[PDB]
Amino acid sequence: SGFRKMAFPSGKVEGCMVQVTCGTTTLNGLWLDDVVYCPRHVICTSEDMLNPNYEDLLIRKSNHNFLVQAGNVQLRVIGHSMQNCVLKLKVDTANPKTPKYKFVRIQPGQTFSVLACYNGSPSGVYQCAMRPNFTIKGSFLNGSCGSVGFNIDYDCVSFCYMHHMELPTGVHAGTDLEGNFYGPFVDRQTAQAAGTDTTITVNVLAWLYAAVINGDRWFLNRFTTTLNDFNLVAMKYNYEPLTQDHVDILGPLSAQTGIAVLDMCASLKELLQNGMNGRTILGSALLEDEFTPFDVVRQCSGVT
Amino acid sequence: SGFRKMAFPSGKVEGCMVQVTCGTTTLNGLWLDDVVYCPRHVICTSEDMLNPNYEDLLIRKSNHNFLVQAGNVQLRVIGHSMQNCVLKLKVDTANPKTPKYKFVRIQPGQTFSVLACYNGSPSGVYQCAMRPNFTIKGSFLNGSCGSVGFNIDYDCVSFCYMHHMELPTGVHAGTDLEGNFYGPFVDRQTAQAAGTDTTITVNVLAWLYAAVINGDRWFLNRFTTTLNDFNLVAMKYNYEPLTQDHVDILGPLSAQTGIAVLDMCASLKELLQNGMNGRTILGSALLEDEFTPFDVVRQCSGVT
Ligand SMILES: Cc1ccncc1NC(=O)[C@@H]1CCC2(CC2)C1
Ligand SMILES: Cc1ccncc1NC(=O)[C@@H]1CCC2(CC2)C1
């Protein structure tokens, strides 16, 4: 019993973190096999950030200009290429600690763990969600660029995020491991609109099931609703519209608890319309949307 | 910018986790040097749990009865001893992945990361606080016993907690690494009173400083208070009384922000008396007490 915002064990990712320096900028790199991946803005200076011409800046760099250090040992760079917003530094040594891994592009609403790093060293790990507007609300200071987000299925690490930018609003933006930004963002020090965000409805429902499983039941009511009626409420409260695909993914939790998905929707509807009335659910005084239905099943059954 | 409930990177602890089986019970062990530490209740059966005679149960066991498996390799047990509520299994091989470590007994109100494990395998990591009443609100299912809590200062892991029990209330209890329970708890399946808990005042203040540093300032007011006046409010709201030692520990945050500790206390006083009025602070709709002043300084400065 108990339900926590759990991150994946970060060990497999810790063994991939390196420091990448180019000129006066130092940030983090991800060393997998004989390739080090890092944000391409490692090649910029202060005068560049407003609108860097990355192609031109990269042309003035050679393999020997990229200083890559794994803990205390230096890696020899034998190639460099820019793919979208990431640099790929080919090194002469394959990382002995390379885990089984994949590069995946996550969907908005999905969750992942971030290993925050500075100068190639891990500082901490936390779980978060990719917002519906493709931003993340992380904890990143200058030097954290290149820190990655990932998920782990048994022995395979699926890398889904690499940190690149802090928007003027204090929210975070980054790319998949092929250097494609999530969202409309560009890697430049410019004010950039993040779309209107919404609350991840399917995740709040998953978390309400986690609450029932762990004893927090006060919010269960005698009502039901329909997808149409619920979606009118979700519209008013800036919640993502619920679809049958979302209901289908909540199936395991509905089956375990015996509470029909539309009945749980009616509980969520009443919580949106009436608030928590000074009460809490799983130690929170707000509706938590950072747990997917998969996260709830995994945590509630002790999957390692 | 941004402030998250960050756990320490768990890699150094992951390399110490082993599976310990004795009879029909399997749980987690911590392998450091040539010693495996685990809860002594691994030697119990269902009929024992109500009030196990651990000394008698342990006398019926021999070194060969403790099955210790590190991933896929079996460890040879050459000695066994019970120290308080932990078993120490001497093995013939020192853990090659033993990090620099210490065993520490944390104080109530201090925080630490837990690496939740099942069958010797890590499932996740989360940060929590040792409650003033010596319980922890974790996420532990059957099989998680032996999972540990720790802190990391550069390369040294300070192990402070080993999980033993879930109280009938769903809160968690465990020991230091010498097997001494935190709190009044005994390792038996019996209803056991946890003392009256309180909110960790110094941590809420630290978190209010973290909020100001990251832009959440709406709760700052034109008032001040005294330790005496504040402690009358803290008494009413079941907050720990604030002492000059707590004010002294908040010094770095008071100096960084320019907000005197007693001024921040006046903000906390008004939040306790008036509530949040449907607003949030660092993504929370309640007063968070799971960040120490040290955690706030570390996270706000990117210590690795
Ligand atoms: C200073 C900082 C803090 C946290 N996270 C990231 C950063 N850095 C940035 O956002 C810079 C400015 C724009 C950029 C994309 C090209 C990199
Ligand atoms: C079933 C479970 C779940 C989570 N954490 C722990 C447990 N197990 C226990 O609490 C047992 C019963 C009493 C005990 C101390 C001797 C071990």
Of the candidates A4, A9, A275, the beta carbon closest to that of B115 is on A9
Residue B205 contacts residue B265 (beta carbons within 8 Å): yes
Ligand number with the minimum distance to the CA of A190: 1
Tell the residue nearest (CA) to atom 13 of ligand 1. A189
Calculate ∠ Cα B58-B76-B65, nearest 5°.
Answer: 30
The closest CB to that of B123, out of A118, A124, A303, belongs to A303
Residue with tokens 């550069």: B154
**The 3-state secondary structure of chain B, one letter per residue:** CCCCCCECCCHHHHCCEEEEEECCEEEEEEEECCEEEEEHHHHCCCCCCCCCCHHHHHHCCCHHHEEEEECCEEECEEEEEEECCEEEEEECCCCCCCCEEEECCCCCCCEEEEEEEECCEEEEEEEEECCCCCCECCCCCCCCCCCEEEEEECCEEEEEEEEEEECCCCCEEEECCCCCECCCCCCCCCCCCCCCCCECHHHHHHHHHHHHHCCCCCCCCCCCCCHHHHHHHHHHCCECCCCHHHHHHCHHHHHHHCCCHHHHHHHHHHHHHHCCCCCCECCECCCCCCCCHHHHHHHHHCCC
Residue of chain A nearest B300, judged by CA positions: A141
Cβ pair A6:B124 closer than 8 A = yes
Q: Do B125 and A125 touch (CB under 8 A)?
A: yes
Find out whether B219 and B211 touch, Cβ atoms under 8 Å: yes
CA dihedral sign of residues B42, B43, B48, B51: negative
Query: Do the Cβ atoms of A13 and A156 come closer than 8 Å?
Result: no
Helix, coil or strand: residue A1:
coil
Gap between the Cα atoms of B171 and B165, Å rounded:
9
Q: In which element (H, E) is residue A252 found?
A: helix A251-257
Question: CATH 1.10.1840.10 occupies which residues in chain B?
Answer: 198-301
Determine, for residues B123 and A6 on separate chains, whether the beta-carbon distance falls below 8 Å.
yes
Q: Resolution (in Å) of the shown entry?
A: 1.6
What's the fold here for domain A1-14+100-197?
Thrombin, subunit H (2.40.10)
A124 alpha carbon to ligand 2 midpoint, in Å? 29
**Among all chains, which residue has been given the structure tokens 């995020």?**
A161
Rounded CA-CA distance B7/A295 in Å is 18
Tell me how far the alpha carbon of residue B153 lies from the centroid of ligand 1, in angstroms: 27
CATH class of B15-99: mainly beta
Name residues whose C-beta falls within 8 Å of residue A24's C-beta, 6 or more positions apart in sequence. Answer: A45
Helix or strand run (H / E) with residue A174: strand A172-175
Q: Find, among B268, B271, B285, the residue nearest to B231 by Cα.
A: B268
Distance from C-alpha of A167 to C-alpha of B225, rounded to nearest angstrom? 37
Beta bridge partners of B25: B22
CB B146 within 8 A of CB B163: yes
Q: How many residues does this entry show for chain B?
A: 304
Distance between CA atoms of residues B246 and B289, nearest Å: 14
Q: Is A145 a catalytic residue?
A: yes
Distance between CA atoms of B203 and B133, rounded to whole angstroms? 15
Domain with CATH 2.40.10.10 in chain A: 1-14+100-197, 15-99
CA A223, CA A233: separation in Å to the nearest integer? 15
B52 CB-near residues (< 8 Å, 6+ apart): B41, B43, B44, B187, B188
Residues A55 and A83: beta-carbon distance below 8 Å: no
Q: How far is it, in rounded angstroms, from Cα A262 to Cα B183? A: 43
Distance of CA A56 to the CA centre of its chain: 31
Closest by CA to A249, choosing from A208, A202, A207, A210, is A202
Distance from CA of B114 to the nearest CA of A (A): 10
Contact B7 A7 (CB under 8 A): yes
Fold for the domain defined by A198-301: main proteinase (3clpro) structure, domain 3 (1.10.1840)
CA distances in angstroms from A252 to A199, A204, A257, A295, B219, listed in the order given: 22, 15, 9, 12, 42
A164 ligand 1 Cβ < 6 A: yes
Instruction: Answer yes or no: are the C-beta atoms of B234 and B241 closer than 8 Å.
Output: yes
Is B145 designated active site?
yes
| Ligand 1 contacts CB of residue A141 (under 6 A) | yes
Nearest ligand to the CA atom of A187: 1
The secondary structure of residue A77, as a DSSP letter, is: E
- Give CA–CA dist B142/A279, Å, rounded: 29
Contact B121/B60 with Cβ under 8 angstroms? no
How many other β-carbons are positioned within 10 Å of the β-carbon of residue A269?
Answer: 22
Contacts of B276 in chain A (CB under 8 A): 285
Measured CA to CA, the distance from residue B293 to residue B27 in angstroms comes to 34
Method: X-ray
Strand partners for B233: none
The span from the CA of A75 to the CA of A68, in Å, is 5
**Facing residues of B28 across strands?**
B19
Amino acid letter, A288 = E
Distance B155 CA to ligand 2 centre (A): 32
| CB A30, CB A179: distance < 8 Å | no
Helix (H, G, I), strand (E, B) or coil at A172: strand
